[PDB]
Amino acid sequence: NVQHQLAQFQQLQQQAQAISVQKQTVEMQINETQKALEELSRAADDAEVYKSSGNILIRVAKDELTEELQEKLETLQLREKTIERQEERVMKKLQEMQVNIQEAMKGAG
Amino acid sequence: QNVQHQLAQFQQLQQQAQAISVQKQTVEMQINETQKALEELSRAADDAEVYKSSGNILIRVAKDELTEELQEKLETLQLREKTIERQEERVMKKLQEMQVNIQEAMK
Amino acid sequence: QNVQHQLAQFQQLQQQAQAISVQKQTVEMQINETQKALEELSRAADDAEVYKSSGNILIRVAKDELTEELQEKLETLQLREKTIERQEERVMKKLQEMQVNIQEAMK
Amino acid sequence: NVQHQLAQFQQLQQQAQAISVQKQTVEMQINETQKALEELSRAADDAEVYKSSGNILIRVAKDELTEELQEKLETLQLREKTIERQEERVMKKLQEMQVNIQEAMKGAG
Amino acid sequence: AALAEIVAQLNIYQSQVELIQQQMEAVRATISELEILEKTLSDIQGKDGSETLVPVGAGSFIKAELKDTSEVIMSVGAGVAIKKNFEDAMESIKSQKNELESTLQKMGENLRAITDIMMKLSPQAEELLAAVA
Amino acid sequence: AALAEIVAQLNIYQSQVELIQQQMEAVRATISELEILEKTLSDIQGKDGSETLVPVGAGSFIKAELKDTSEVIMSVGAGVAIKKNFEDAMESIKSQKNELESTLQKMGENLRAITDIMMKLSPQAEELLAAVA
Incomplete structure (x- = not known):
């Protein structure tokens, strides 16, 4: 069937759009994480920093907070690379x- | 009841079905946010500096008091989600x- | 400049004329509210309990300090009104x- | 001119509408003043009451505040009566x- | 012929149904705010001296210490505010919510009637349309 | 004939002019909030211990005493907030206002071009209309 291949080709075009x-989205989360890490590095080593989780706000050690964002940043970057590879x-x-x-x-001939 | 009013009820019900959805x-969203807060709290020290949200202000409260309040909130929300699903059905x-x-x- | 663009400027100017109006x-409104506050303050005792508005909060301040601030605000607004009228003309x-x-x- | 009387009659119909x-408006201000005076009378004689004037809030003696609203209430009621008289x-x-x-x-005849 | 008369009025009704639906939202909005207010006053009872963070705009917060938490200054109209204790304050709030709820009950009826009469006019506009064509 | 081609595109432009006018308002709105924030932080400097009234909803206010007024907890994105002193805080605010102003300057240009090209297409749609009738 040639019409079954058109559909598959079209379903794949939408996937390409989804992945896009x-x-x-991942790029946006990367920019936001980077912006926050930049702010944290300009603050002094004993700056009081906080983390919001839902309806609560809690004070957290700056070095633990920095490491937490670094891990999220690095995991998102790896994700972005995996996405581009799937894209190609x-x-x-x-x-x-x-x-x-x-x-x-x-068809035939 | 004629088909015209029968159809009116059907669409009314569809309205309900969407409002329930x-x-x-919303409750699913609220449950996830509450479980996140509970997670973060479990990591903090007992004397941690934490504030809870209450409309236009945040109020500082001890970690243990807040943990119990969030646990109760989580349980009320999970029951709420159960009620909503039963109504949806x-x-x-x-x-x-x-x-x-x-x-x-x-x- | 052709009549088409000439007319475009005229309507642009009318736009300005309305935004200025x-x-x-607004400034007239702000001037009246400031003069009212000044009036009420003049009646109160020097140790009166008064709060001034500052966005999301009200701040308690002594009557004399607030009177000077409102006087300065009134003067800046009256100059503002004078500027607006000159631009309007x-x-x-x-x-x-x-x-x-x-x-x-x-x- | 009969057309000059139609206009005057019509201008007077609009006035009737304006006055209305x-x-x-006066009735609304009367209801609001009454509502505030009712609240003030239910509060204790030493209740702390405040007056807002523009962007400021000031604490004022409750007995002076009550008298001030009473005067405004009475002046508005007199105004309402004057309006109805103009209306008639x-x-x-x-x-x-x-x-x-x-x-x-x-016309003629 | 007399079809436009109907196809026209079903609008003055469709233009009144949506208006009431709007006014009912405002009322629900007010009730919501009163509910949040109740939670805050409840949440601060017994907290004299506790620290609080006040949102001052664009994600920024300043520090303050709660004071005389059993008291709340409440607006009563016409430029007047009265300081009330916790019980009195919660009592006024519940009264207002009840009043607004009651107002919501009433608005509901008005919307019903309108939706109802529209139901009896449509069967007519549909059969008149079948005649013209 | 080719009139509809113009009478049609002057819409994709009239539907883009109003969109930018909207986005420019949001930006102005944000700038306003930052200006009010600047006033509040300025207004509290030197007021440790001063009483304040915090609006908690529906015209109600509670009492508190300002604390560590030279410090403000500011949101920096991704769920993080940092406590900063007065000068640093005012410095960030001015930077953001400048950035938003700059963004407003740019949005202004985009709106200009669009309004400009519309001006050159109308003289054509008007003379084509005179032909069809």
């Missing part, structure tokens, strides 16, 4: 499946 | 029942 | 001048 | 001027 959105595969599988249709159409 | 998302049942009473009234 | 009403002048440059361009 | 609005005159002058037109129309 996840990437924009999808694009290749896409340009591919397009070819398989760009010729299966000239 | 909105409460369901009741409305779904009434929806299917009303659609059947409508299909058989159309012929 | 809105600032004028400038725009009115430009409006009439632009309408004349438009009537003579139409014939 | 002033009356609704306007209505009469209206039903009147209508007559002067309901016949000046049968």
Whole structure:
């Protein structure tokens, strides 16, 4: 069926779109984490820092807080790289499946 | 009851079904935020400096007192979520029942 | 400059004229409220309990300190009102001048 | 001119409308003053009461504050009565001027 | 012919249903604020001397120590405010909530009638339409 | 004939002018809040121990005593807040206002261009209309 390949090709185009959105989201969380880490490093070593979790605000040691954001930053960056890698595969599988249709159409002969 | 009013109830029920779906998302959100706060609290020292949110102000409170309050809040919310799901099922049942009473009234 | 752009400036000026008229009403309002506060303060005793508004909170302050602050505020607002009226006249002048440059361009 | 009397009759109809609005406004201020005086009388004689004036809030003796609202209440009530009296005159002058037109129309003869 | 008469009034009703739905929200909004107010006053009882953080804008907070927590200055209209103790304050709040609830009960009825009469006019506008075409 | 092409795009532009006008307001709104924040922090300097009234809803206020007024806890994003002294705090606020002002300057340009090109398309849509009729 050639119409079954069009659908798969189209479902894959939406995935490419979805993944594109996840990437924009992760990038935003990276910028925000970076901005917070920059603020924390300019503050003195004994600055009083706080963490909000839901409806509560709690004072936390600055060195533990910094490490916590660093880990989140690093995990998000790895995630961004994993996303881009998935992105390329999808694009290749896409340009591919397009070819398989760009010729299966000239059906027989 | 004629099909016109039968259909009016069906759409009314769909209205209820959607409003309940909105409460369901809210309580789930509130449960997750409460469990997060409980998690962060478990890590802090007993003399930790913590403030709880109460409308326009934050009030400083001891970690143990806040832990008990958040535990109670979590339990009330989980019961609330259970109630919402039971109501959601009741409305779904009434929806299917009303659609059947409508299909058989159309012929 | 063709009549089309001439007319565009005229309407732009009318936009300015209206935004200025809105600032004028606001400052007048702010002046009246400040004079009222000054009036009420003059009646109170020197040790009166008074609070001044500062965004999300009210701050207790001595009557004399508050009287001087409100006096300065009143003077700054009255100068502001004077500035606004002078600008209003400038725009009115430009409006009439632009309408004349438009009537003579139409014939 | 009969058309000059129609205009005057119409200008007077709008005044009647305006006055009607002033009356609704004064009534509202009366209700609000009454509500505040009721609250003040239920509070104890040594209750701490405050007056807001613009951006400031000031503590004032309750007996002076009560007297101040009483005077405002009484002045507003007198105003309401003056308004209703003006209202009746306007209505009469209206039903009147209508007559002067309901016949000046049968112009001559 | 007389179809437009109906297709027209079902609007003055659809323009009044949405207005009441709006006014009912405002009322619900007010009730919400009163509920949050009740929680704050309850939350501070017995906390004289406890620290608090006051939001002052754009995510910023300043420090203060609660004082005379069993008392609250409440606005009663016409530029007047009265200091009241905890019980009296909670009592006024419940009275207002009740009043607003009652007002909500009443607004509900008004909306019903309107929705009801609309139901009896539509069956007519639908059969008149079938005639014109 | 090609009139609809113009009478149509002048909308995608009229639907983009109003969007920017909206976004510019939000920005002005944020700037306003930062200005009020600056006034409050200035107003409390040197007032440790002074009483304050905190609005808690529906016209009600509670009492508190200001504490460590030269310090303010400020939100820096990602769930983190940092306590800063007066000078540092005012410095961050001015930086943000400047940034938002700068952002406002830029949004202004974008709106200009759009309004400008619309001016050159209307003279055409008006003469095409004169042709069709």
